[PDB]
């Protein structure tokens, strides 16, 4: 049941975004708010679908002692409202025996990848920069999966952020980021 819940969520809430550093899939949480990993760093404007949607507010998340957490949220400057997902999203990180990662880019239209187990990683030191609330799974390979969307039957868990040719990791999606 989580593929059909996972096709129903990137229909209405994703995108494929265009920055200076790549291709990206993008989440929409509610009002003009969206999700990105941190190292798409999105300047001024991005490339939504294929249009030039100017960016109004940047927040790169980190814990508080500052350290990372690979999101950034990012307030858009267009007419219509995301579909509020924060209902479906949890307040602290969260252990499955079974997720689907979902991606959207020009490079994996519209796939989905059962994963396994989600597991509680703690901190990675990802790219150089220790990282805190990873989400881990077994994931071959690498490339143009960033900004995937991890989840589970009724759950958003995540946001795709990286991984090491065996293991991936997702940045935990928490509700207190978004009120």
Not at 7 to 15: E, G, H, L, Q, T
Not at 126 to 155: E, I
Request: hydrophobic share 40%; with cysteine.
């Amino acid at each position: 049941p989580a593929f059909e819940f996972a096709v129903a969520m990137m229909k209405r809430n994703s995108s494929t975004v265009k920055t200076e550093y790549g291709e990206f899939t993008m989440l929409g949480i509610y009002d003009k708010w969206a999700v990105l990993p941190r190292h798409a760093k999105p300047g001024p404007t991005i490339l939504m679908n294929d249009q030039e949607v100017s960016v109004l507010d940047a927040k790169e998340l980190v814990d508080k002692d500052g350290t990372n957490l690979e999101l950034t949220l990012l307030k858009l400057n267009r007419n219509e409202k995301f579909r509020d997902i924060r209902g479906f999203l949890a307040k602290e990180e969260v252990e499955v025996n079974e997720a689907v990662l979902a991606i959207n880019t020009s490079k994996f239209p519209n796939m989905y990848i059962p994963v396994g187990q989600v597991t509680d990683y703690g901190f990675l030191n990802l790219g150089g920069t220790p990282t805190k609330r990873m989400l881990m799974y077994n994931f071959p390979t690498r490339a143009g999966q960033c900004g995937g969307v991890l989840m589970s039957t009724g759950k958003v868990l995540g946001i795709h952020v990286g991984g090491n040719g065996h293991q991936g990791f997702s940045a935990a999606l928490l509700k207190h980021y978004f009120n």
